[PDB]
């Protein structure tokens, strides 16, 4: 899940605070690429 990727520990600061991956990035379950967007009679669609 996105939550588990969020709590990936990149490094620990000198004072003690933790820099997580969600502190330096936005993490969502998006598409491999955003090239193709299909529609069937106007409404959202996919296909083969």
């Amino acid at each position: 899940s996105t939550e588990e990727f969020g709590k990936i520990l990149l490094k620990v600061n000198q004072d003690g605070s933790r820099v997580l991956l969600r502190d330096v990035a936005k993490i969502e379950l998006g598409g491999e690429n955003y090239d193709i967007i299909a529609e069937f009679n106007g409404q959202p669609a996919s296909g083969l």
Partner: protein, 48 residues
């Protein structure tokens, strides 16, 4: 049927704090307990 298995969780913060890389940890565990195919050698004109 499912069987009891020994789940071990490597603490990332403690590993980064002591200065122990995750590669060295996971290799030491994997190589020792599981085994590791390193490379080939020639035994009486036969690759093994």
């Amino acid at each position: 049927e499912d069987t009891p298995q020994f789940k071990i969780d490597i603490d990332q913060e403690k590993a980064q704090a002591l200065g122990v890389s995750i590669n060295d940890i996971n290799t030491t565990l994997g190589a020792a307990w599981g085994g590791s195919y390193v490379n080939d050698f020639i035994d009486r004109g036969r690759v093994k």
